[PDB]
Design an enzyme around this catalytic site. Structure first.
Site, PDB file in Angstrom:
ATOM      1  N   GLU A   1       0.834  -1.198   0.000  1.00 46.10           N
ATOM      2  CA  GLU A   1       0.000   0.000   0.000  1.00 46.10           C
ATOM      3  C   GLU A   1       0.876   1.259   0.000  1.00 46.10           C
ATOM      4  OE1 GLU A   1      -3.117   1.888  -0.801  1.00 46.10           O
ATOM      5  OE2 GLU A   1      -3.740  -0.017   0.057  1.00 46.10           O
TER       6      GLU A   1
ATOM      7  N   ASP B   1      -2.055  -5.186   1.098  1.00 47.21           N
ATOM      8  CA  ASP B   1      -1.414  -4.077   1.813  1.00 47.21           C
ATOM      9  C   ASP B   1       0.037  -4.390   2.209  1.00 47.21           C
ATOM     10  OD1 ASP B   1      -3.534  -2.219   1.855  1.00 47.21           O
ATOM     11  OD2 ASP B   1      -4.543  -3.467   3.359  1.00 47.21           O
TER      12      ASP B   1
ATOM     13  N   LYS C   1     -14.623  -8.011   3.190  1.00 44.99           N
ATOM     14  CA  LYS C   1     -13.271  -8.273   2.725  1.00 44.99           C
ATOM     15  C   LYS C   1     -13.114  -9.733   2.290  1.00 44.99           C
ATOM     16  CE  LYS C   1     -10.889  -4.455   2.901  1.00 44.99           C
ATOM     17  NZ  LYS C   1     -10.048  -4.047   1.751  1.00 44.99           N
TER      18      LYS C   1
END
Ligand SMILES: O=C(O)c1cccc(-c2cc(=O)c(O)c(C(=O)O)[nH]2)c1
Ligand SMILES: [Mn+2]
Ligand SMILES: [Mn+2]
Length: 177
Positions: free
Chosen positions: A63, A91, A117
């Site tokens: 990320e 991420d 998610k």
């Protein structure tokens, strides 16, 4: 907008600039979509803090990179560990547990966001933080020690209370998609 001021006043420049860049490349104005801006900053800071609590190089940050580099990092990790290539950019990579991590941050219920998610994705590990000190992670494996987790939770509660302090929290609370 106090919200725009608050973002600038409560997150380090790198994060603000990254957040700003990301919105502005995709036609989005941080002066208008201000709750989104706050949220991105928030998620970045968490992503970075998570990384920093790491074999001294425990985590790889995905990320916050540009997309070319993000993919470059991910592929390079796949080719030398054998791990299946994710569909969406996660991420973090965990070099110790040798898995990708998806960090979630929610103003809703942790279990609620966890499902969203899990549903959207891979054998990526999931870790969800809320602004209430609650967290949820796959197979309840929280990856980090308690101190590292306490620090993330404290930073999120604090952001919440600063927003609250500036009468900004009800907007922000009710603005998650
Ligand atoms: O909640 C949303 O509005 C939303 C919709 C699609 C993606 C994301 C999102 C959440 C994330 O936590 C994240 O890490 C990424 C990413 O681009 O890497 N993207 C967030
Ligand atoms: Mn991400
Ligand atoms: Mn994430």
């Amino acid at each position: 907008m106090a919200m725009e001021d608050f973002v600038r006043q409560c997150f380090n420049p790198m994060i603000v600039e990254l957040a700003e860049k990301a919105m502005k490349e995709y036609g989005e104005d941080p002066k208008i979509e201000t709750n989104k801006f706050a949220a991105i900053c928030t998620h970045l800071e968490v992503c970075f803090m998570y990384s920093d609590f790491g074999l001294k190089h425990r985590f790889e940050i995905i990320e916050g990179r540009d997309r070319i580099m993000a993919w470059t990092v991910v592929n390079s990790i796949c080719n030398t560990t054998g791990v299946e290539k994710p569909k969406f950019l996660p991420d973090l990579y965990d070099y110790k547990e040798n898995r990708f991590i998806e960090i979630g941050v929610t103003r809703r219920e942790v279990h609620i966001y966890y499902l969203e998610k899990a549903n959207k994705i891979e054998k990526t590990h999931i870790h969800i933080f809320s602004f209430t000190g609650e967290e949820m992670a796959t197979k309840a494996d929280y990856t980090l020690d308690e101190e590292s987790r306490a620090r993330i939770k404290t930073r999120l509660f604090t952001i919440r209370q600063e927003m609250a302090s500036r009468s900004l929290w009800d907007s922000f609370r009710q603005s998650e998609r």
